[PDB]
């Protein structure tokens with residue numbers, strides 16, 4: 066079970082890293098350039114925790130057949146607490162500065178829209194498929210790695 | 216020591232001409248404009264170096280150009296796929312003199328872990344490279360270190376001052392390898408922190 | 414200090430140059446360019462005449478002349494765009510079907 | 514467009530200016546490499562070395 | 574006079590120094606260093622700019638002498654600006670001043 | 675003779691103004707870099723010299739000693755001419771600004787008209803750069819930028835006609851002498867905002883800036899384009915201070931100091947607008963230029979005329 070929880074935490078940290086990159090890159094594609102700087106600061110906080118645990122930033126290669134490469138280092142919980150206290154204020158600031166801007170909404174709303182049938186017929190998964198209203202996530206439909214305990 | 220291109224020669228370098236060539240080299244090394252070119256994950260760490268937590272703008276090397284004509288430095292940061300190799304060659308040819316090349320990451324250095332049918336084994340198969348960065352990916356501060364190494368290489372080189380007056384040969388300093396320079400301090404390391412703590 | 418005759422002669426020189434450019438050119442665009450030259454020369458002559466007498470009327474007629482020039486340049490370039498769309502060439506000699 | 518939409522959009526632009534100005538008033542988050550040395554965790558995967566045993570002989 | 578000819582000299586020197594600085598800048602750039610179908614909407618926008626620019630010149634001439642023209646000048650400029658806004662409304666409502674349909 | 679030394683002193687004043695304006699444009703390209711760092715929770719260039727002060731000289735040397743390049747199957751005169759226009763037009767537009775009592779280059783009867791002349795000539799830089807490059811993408815981008823420029827230059831003049839209507843003259847010194855009690859930011863607030871948007875838009879600044887029309891430019895011509903951009907920023911800010919904020923007028927400090935702080939204030943706000951605002955789409959930009967701002971300027975002039983004729 067500890068292997069399941071460790072792998073879930075690492076995957077969620079990297080999911081937050083990827084989502085911060087995606088949101089900042091979308092905002093930069095709209096035309097606002099400062100949230101990518103701040104989101105990369107938050108990515109540096111995540112990278113601090115991931116560097117502490119796995120010894121690498123981007124390609125940790127830390128999972129193993131039957132577990133993970135090492136035990137968690139002493140003091141990982143302090144870095145996780147620091148990131149968990151740092152994140153939500155920054156996310157709210159990102160929303161208020163860029164995601165609620167009407168210029169961004171005019172650039173984004175109604176652009177390249179598809180429904181459930183088009184998403185299903187093209188194999189679309191993830192946020193697009195769930196944005197069509199179909200509630201299909203692998204972590205709930207076909208649970209793996211102890212995700213049912215969360 | 217120097218390498219000639221138009222041959223291993225000596226230092227060619229009047230006292231006003233030397234000072235003004237030094238000012239040319241200082242201006243070139245303190246004003247480096249990298250080219251915006253996304254190949255793979257190494258480019259993500261390169262643009263991480265561009266961001267606020269690292270601020271490579273402090274060195275004057277943040278001006279990212281979408282046009283190769285206005286870019287002085289090409290950072291090959293990613294794998295040299297066989298379909299992308301003519302594109303990289305054309306983009307390098309579109310740049311203007313003086314042009315410098317930094318290979319970032321094991322893929323650009325040698326092919327890295329992709330000794331595979333669809334990958335060119337290193338960008339130096341077809342494009343000259345001045346600074347290599349090992350890593351997969353190199354961290355953003357390693358990119359900054361390679362930038363400083365490029366500035367030291369630029370500040371010690373001799374280029375034609377004008378296309379109508381003087382020698383038109385390009386002189387590149389054969390600097391000491393960083394491995395032999397840092398062998399004094401690296402071998403003397405005795406104890407490192409244990410991996411159990413943070 | 415400046416003669417009125419010299420300004421009038423300069424306007425006449427520009428007018429006849431615009432007329433020559435209007436006649437000798439087969440491309441419709443250079444015909445429109447020559448028309449702009451002629452109307453600018455006429456406006457210049459009105460400015461010279463108004464400045465000689467110390468009146469505002471020359472500059473007022475200049476304003477009316479450049480209003481006409483703006484309108485005519487707009488209409489002529491619209492017609493030239495229409496000609497290039499329909500016939501894919503700006504040869505004015507090919508627009509000669511009606512005769513007799 | 515609607516005048517209400519124009520006023521709401523102007524308010525959102527004013528809000529964006531205000532937050533970026535306040536972010537200018539904030540504290541810097543830049544780690545000043547190379548003057549500030551990079552903190553690396555002990556198990557960081559960088560340069561490879563060969564080590565020695567406590568008796569001084571090479572472990573390989 | 575004296576001040577007006579001093580200012581004429583200063584303006585001429587400003588002109589020639591700016592032009593010479595730009596030309597010398599490009600000359601020094603060339604010297605130094607070693608060697609190795611568009612849509613009609615563009616026409617419509619430029620045409621609208623020309624027409625409203627001439628009408629703007631009329632308003633330029635109006636604005637300088639407000640207190641020398643009385644209320645009759647305000648009235649005449651009011652019919653002028655009413656026809657201006659009527660043309661603007663006409664262009665907007667038919668799709669002339671819209672880049673996308 | 676006193677006349678000769680007065681003429682030479684006025685010429686020296688004009689040359690000093692010109693050199694300070696060019697230096698301000700280049701040094702505030704560097705200052706734009708530093709301010710973008712400051713606004714973005716970072717530092718910007720602070721290594722080349724004391725506080726980065728020599729970074730601009732490094733950029734200047736790098737562009738001076740770059741290989742000069744013109745596309746082969748391209749026009750040469752038009753290609754070389756476009757950066758000259760982009761520099762010279764707004765650099766010459768500065769010549770009407772009153773900086774302090776006794777410091778003006780040309781006390782023209784037209785003034786504001788000379789600024790409008792310079793902007794109207796300034797659109798040719800974008801058009802010429804797009805056509806001469808022999809690139810379809812650069813040509814299309816330049817036609818787009820030129821259409822936007824015309825869309826905002828069409829109401830720039832009326833946005834200033836409010837101030838001219840209040841002052842009753844085209845002269846700049848009379849305009850700043852009409853601010854001895856109330857600055858035009860309060861009555862001509864619509865004129866203030868529309869001149870702000872128009873001055874940002876004709877300078878192709880954020881958020882008003884088919885690839886770009888500068889891709890074929892390199893070396894010292896790219897430097898001409900950028901330095902002309904920042905020189906235009908200096909000129910627009912100084913015009914803004916002259917027209918709407920009293921120019922040299924102030925209670926305690928010497929008049930040049932007041933003019934300098936207000937001009938620096940508006941250049942700081944220019945860089946802050948670059949840092950903060952997002953870029954709208956093309957059609958939204960043209961619609962905001964035409965549908966909103968032009969009737970706003972017309973109505974502002976009409977209401978201004980009715981108000982001043984009321985007294």
Ligand SMILES: CCCCCCCCCCCCCCCCCC(=O)OC[C@H](COP(=O)(O)OCCN)OC(=O)CCCCCCCCCCCCCCCCC
Pocket residue numbers: 167168170171172174175514518519520521522523526527530870871874880881943944947954955958959962
């Ligand atoms: C004073 C000191 C500083 C001086 C320096 C210069 C200042 C000005 C700088 C330039 C300002 C550029 C403004 C650009 C306006 C663009 C308008 C636009 O794009 O509107 C479209 C947008 C969305 O419209 P919609 O129809 O919903 O979209 C299609 C739907 N799919 O609709 C909207 O977003 C509606 C609102 C449009 C914008 C309204 C006006 C905004 C003005 C700029 C912000 C000013 C902030 C305060 C500055 C300091 C004041 C002291």
Ligand SMILES: CCCCCCCCCCCCCCCCCC(=O)OC[C@H](COP(=O)(O)OCCN)OC(=O)CCCCCCCCCCCCCCCCC
Pocket residue numbers: 577581584585588589592758759762763766781782783784788795796798
């Ligand atoms: C690439 C080069 C292109 C061409 C560049 C220019 C070529 C000529 C360069 C030399 C010019 C020298 C200066 C000329 C005289 C200046 C003084 C002057 O014009 O004084 C006359 C008048 C004075 O009036 P005022 O002072 O208001 O009233 C009191 C009357 N004693 O004041 C006036 O009438 C002021 C109004 C006229 C000012 C004109 C200034 C130049 C305008 C052209 C700029 C061209 C920009 C580049 C090309 C754009 C793209 C094509």
Ligand SMILES: CCCCCCCCCCCCCCCCCCCC
Pocket residue numbers: 690691694695698773774775777908912928929930931934937
């Ligand atoms: C961005 C602003 C550019 C301004 C360029 C012109 C600078 C002119 C400097 C004149 C200084 C003296 C002004 C008269 C005396 C009053 C001030 C005395 C104390 C400095």
Ligand code: SF4
Pocket residue numbers: 255256257258292293294319320321322323327350351352353
């Ligand atoms: S060297 Fe590694 S990190 Fe860089 S491009 Fe190759 S796989 Fe990606």
